[PDB]
């Protein structure tokens, strides 16, 4: 009967009120554990979906039938080993507030992943040793490419200058170290977490702690993939995230990506009838144009919910209605080491296979601009500094005007290519 | 060779040069650079370099490009570059070019709008002087940051749906106004009265509408910028007090902004079916850049009906950024938007073709002028500009980039006789504001009646 939306996530929330917004005679429950009465909050957590019955219960024991629903139950933050009291992940304010407490009574933290939340971490926090160990050759590999690594890390050697949390929870909570050392880092490459042993096992073993990473007994230690073993007060594993499907999947057949999200085709549909999704519990299946791709995040989140808003209303009304421009191209712009990143298009030339070329323009400590053109056309680019270009960038994207005639010089310093494109 | 190209090329008076006929295979009408001693030397090293790079692909030299367009079908004046004149896709940036309406064969270039239409800025006084805003400077920063939508990926506050979309696109100014983002008065000091009847939204490209709908009230990343600014300096007082600028000192906002998406997507849609037509009507043009379309063909009824609706579109999101910039200094200021006299000098657009009445060859006739990177600069006794600067002279706004100075400007008859009332821009983004204004002014073609220095800057 009542439209359902499930989690207080940007996507639960932007979903709830743009439907509400569509509908402001019914309403609509958003589920989760003002500016639009008609939405109501239950404040609880769901165990499982009924999709035979069409029904939902929550962990207060109370049930649901759903006309609609919309799942963005979010994603947990998958672990190096979970039930270790010294592992830490990000995933919600009380994480944030506990790495907080943690943070501003330690030093020698080690964080394991080259992702998001560990690229915001090293540039965040002072004050204690960071031990970096990443799975990958450089830097940022999920964001970057190998140029883009040599610019950033370069700025790294450099001083500094119930909602999961979204794009910026780091100005919310000061995160200062007992050492006050701003930016004493090690970075390990192509390592990986072994074991993990407590101070116990460590003193049962006999083995030998390797000494501080340059140019004492700590709580726990943590032996890598090579042959250093380092210790830490705590340790912070980002290791990516994985969608909460674990309490929807029960019961009932939904098909699963490679990514484990609901699969979800271009009217958001998740394989099974009248149930719908967005944010990172779902996956992207239907037929991807060839300058984008789905990344989980804030601005992805807000346009699926939106998108998931308006299908859902399509449907209620009979009426059909064709995907939203923000599928056409994807962009990011986001700061990393307090350096704007907006990556266009297939940035790291992703799914170009074979065919693709790289034009590249870049001054040390200012700016870093890469260009992606598979045929002479501009699939995507990575831009990163204080460049205005990113307007232009885009609708040379989503034109595909033919740039081969313009040459190499697409690029060059002395001509104002946003004014030429304006 | 340099000395070969140099010989078409003759000075007409100390602030213009001239292009004679020949300097490009096919040339109509003759072409004009009007230029100061300085940003001359740099005008003349475009065409320089370019001559020594052999056979030299895409970013062809300013003056080349300005007499490509003294090739095309129709060209009834000089066709000439302002000061701010720069590499543009087609015409070079800073060129008017005008063709009679009336000859049969007549044409109309996407690249002689530009890619986005009708980028404009608007200034809008205020009775606050840089004393009161400068202890909050950061507060109201803020303010217009959360109020403002900004950069790539942005989604508008304002709700926007595809029949109120299609409403301003036929509409312009007159739907804000009517909506309650905008004042009667705004409608007054505004080019056109922001309106442009020609539009038709069912011409403009759905591809273009699904752009359009989510963008409208963003300012976008690139030049688009919304920054607030006080008066340093007042070299027309009378234009000042007409204006209302009565002390230096008193603080200003320009909103520098356009179409966003619709604009490029019209203009792409516009290339794609002027290549077409180019072999049909044989539109023979000396550039591939340069795409061209008989007015008289629907090709070219085509795109002037949609370089309208982007026009409307694109006075919008300027009136909608001005009624969000009102809001976030009358919260900052603690009182009414109207109590702090939030009204607007005046709103004129760079990137626009307009059918317009010039008196040419002695007889007068209607002209569609073709101006990109050029501001619109009507006589101090033109019957169609606001009746408060019906003396002085429609407001020119030019506009500065990291933090150099902006200027406001006024017209001129002589500006009127020379350029059909065309004057600059603003900067290229190593030729001043400065220098550039100082030419329009010291040509006869502007002048200057106020200066502003920026002091918030709301980019993306
Ligand atoms: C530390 C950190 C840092 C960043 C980011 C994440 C994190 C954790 N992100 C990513 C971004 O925050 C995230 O991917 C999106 O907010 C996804 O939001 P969802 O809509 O999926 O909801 P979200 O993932 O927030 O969903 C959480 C909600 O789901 C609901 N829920 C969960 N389980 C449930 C259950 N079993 N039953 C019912 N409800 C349930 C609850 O209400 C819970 O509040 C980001 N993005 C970006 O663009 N820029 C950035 O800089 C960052 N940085
Ligand atoms: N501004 C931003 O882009 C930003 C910042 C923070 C978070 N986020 C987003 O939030 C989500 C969570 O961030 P995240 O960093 O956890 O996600 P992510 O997907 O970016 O992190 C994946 C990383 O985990 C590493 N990894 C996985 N298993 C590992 C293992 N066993 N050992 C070592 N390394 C391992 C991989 O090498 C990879 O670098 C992502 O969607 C991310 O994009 C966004
Ligand atoms: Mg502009
Ligand atoms: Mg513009």
Redesign the pocket.
Same mark, same amino acid.
């Given at each position: 009967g009542k439209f359902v939306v499930?989690? /207080?996530?940007? #996507? @639960?929330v932007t979903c709830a009120e743009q439907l509400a917004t569509h509908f402001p005679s019914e309403d609509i429950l958003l589920? $989760? #554990?003002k500016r639009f009465p008609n939405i109501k909050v239950i404040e609880? /957590?769901? *165990?499982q979906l009924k999709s035979e019955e069409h029904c939902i219960v $929550?962990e207060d024991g109370n049930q649901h039938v759903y006309k609609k629903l919309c799942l963005? #139950? /979010? +994603?947990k &933050?998958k672990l190096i080993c979970e039930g270790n009291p010294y592992v830490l992940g990000?995933? !919600?304010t009380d994480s =944030?507030q506990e790495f907080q407490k943690q943070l501003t009574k330690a030093k020698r933290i080690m964080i394991i992943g080259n992702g998001?939340?560990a690229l915001?971490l090293v540039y965040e926090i002072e004050g204690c040793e960071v031990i970096w160990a990443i799975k990958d050759k450089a830097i940022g590999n999920t964001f970057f490419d190998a140029g883009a690594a040599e610019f950033l890390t370069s700025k790294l050697i450099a001083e500094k200058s /119930?909602? #999961?949390? @979204? &794009? !910026?929870?780091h100005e919310g909570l000061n995160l200062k170290g007992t050492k006050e050392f701003s930016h004493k880092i090690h970075l390990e490459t192509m390592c990986e977490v072994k074991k993990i042993y407590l101070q116990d096992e460590f003193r049962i073993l006999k083995k030998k702690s390797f000494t501080f990473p340059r140019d004492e007994m700590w709580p726990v230690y943590v032996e890598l993939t090579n042959e250093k073993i380092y210790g830490c007060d705590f340790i912070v594993s980002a290791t990516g995230?994985t969608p909460?499907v674990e &309490?929807?999947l029960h019961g009932n057949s939904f098909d699963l990506g490679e990514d484990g999200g609901l699969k979800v085709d271009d009217h958001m549909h998740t394989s099974l009838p009248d149930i719908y999704a +967005?944010? !990172?519990?779902c996956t992207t299946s239907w037929q991807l144009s060839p300058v984008w791709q789905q990344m989980?995040?804030? $601005?992805? =989140?807000r346009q699926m919910?939106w998108y998931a808003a308006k299908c859902m209303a399509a449907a209620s009304s009979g009426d059909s209605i064709d995907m939203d421009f923000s599928f056409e191209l994807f962009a990011?712009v $986001? *700061?990393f080491f307090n350096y704007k990143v907006v990556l266009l298009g297939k940035y790291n030339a992703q799914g170009l296979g074979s065919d693709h070329e790289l034009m590249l323009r870049c001054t040390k400590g200012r700016e870093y601009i890469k260009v992606v053109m598979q045929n002479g056309r501009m699939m995507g680019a990575v831009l990163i500094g204080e460049t205005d270009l990113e307007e232009t960038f885009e609708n040379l994207i989503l034109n595909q005007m033919n740039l081969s005639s313009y040459g190499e010089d697409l690029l060059d310093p002395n001509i104002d290519i946003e004014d030429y494109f304006d | 060779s340099y000395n070969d190209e140099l010989q078409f090329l003759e000075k007409i008076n100390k602030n213009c040069w001239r292009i004679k006929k020949g300097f490009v295979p096919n040339m109509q009408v003759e072409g004009v650079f009007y230029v100061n001693d300085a940003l001359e030397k740099l005008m003349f090293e475009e065409l320089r370099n370019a001559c020594r790079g052999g056979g030299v692909g895409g970013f062809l030299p300013a003056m080349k490009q300005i007499g490509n367009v003294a090739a095309l079908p129709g060209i009834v004046h000089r066709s000439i570059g302002l000061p701010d004149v720069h590499s543009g896709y087609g015409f070079a940036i800073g060129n008017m070019a005008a063709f009679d309406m009336n000859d049969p064969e007549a044409v109309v270039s996407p690249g002689g709008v530009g890619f986005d239409i009708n980028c404009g800025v608007r200034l809008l006084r205020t009775n606050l002087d840089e004393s009161d805003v400068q202890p909050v400077k950061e507060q109201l920063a803020q303010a217009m940051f959360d109020h403002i939508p900004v950069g790539v990926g942005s989604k508008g506050v304002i709700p926007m749906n595809a029949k109120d979309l299609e409403e301003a696109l036929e509409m312009g100014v007159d739907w804000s106004l009517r909506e309650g983002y905008a004042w009667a008065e705004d409608k007054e000091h505004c080019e056109e009265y922001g309106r442009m009847l020609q539009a038709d939204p069912n011409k403009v490209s759905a591809r273009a509408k699904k752009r359009g709908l989510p963008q409208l009230g963003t300012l976008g990343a690139g030049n688009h910028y919304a920054e607030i600014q006080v008066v340093d300096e007042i070299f027309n007082e009378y234009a000042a007090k007409k204006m209302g600028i009565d002390h230096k000192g008193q603080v200003c906002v320009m909103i520098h902004s356009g179409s966003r998406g619709l604009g490029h997507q019209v203009a792409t849609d516009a290339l794609v079916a002027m290549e077409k037509a180019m072999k049909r009507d044989k539109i023979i043009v000396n550039d591939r850049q340069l795409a061209c379309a008989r007015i008289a063909s629907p090709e070219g009824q085509d795109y002037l009906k949609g370089m309208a609706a982007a026009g409307n579109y694109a006075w919008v999101n300027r009136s909608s950024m001005t009624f969000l910039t009102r809001q976030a200094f009358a919260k900052v200021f603690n009182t009414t938007p109207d109590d702090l006299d939030l009204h607007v000098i005046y709103d004129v657009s760079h990137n626009i073709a307009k059918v317009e009445q010039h008196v040419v060859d002695g007889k007068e006739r209607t002209l569609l002028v073709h101006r990109k990177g050029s501001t619109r600069a009507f006589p101090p006794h033109h019957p169609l500009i606001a009746v408060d600067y019906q003396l002085t002279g429609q407001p020119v706004l030019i506009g500065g980039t990291m933090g150099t100075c902006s200027y406001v400007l006024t017209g001129t008859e002589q500006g009127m006789t020379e350029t059909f009332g065309t004057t600059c821009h603003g900067a290229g983004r190593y030729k001043n504001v400065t220098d550039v204004v100082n030419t329009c002014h010291d040509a006869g073609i502007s002048k200057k009646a106020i200066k502003l220095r920026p002091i918030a800057v709301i980019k993306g």
């Open positions: 499930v989690g /207080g996530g940007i #996507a @639960g589920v $989760t #554990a609880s /957590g769901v *165990k $929550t963005c #139950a /979010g +994603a &933050p990000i995933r !919600d =944030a998001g939340i915001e /119930g909602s #999961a949390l @979204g &794009p !910026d929870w995230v909460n &309490p929807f +967005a944010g !990172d519990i989980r995040l804030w $601005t992805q =989140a919910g990011h $986001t *700061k | -």
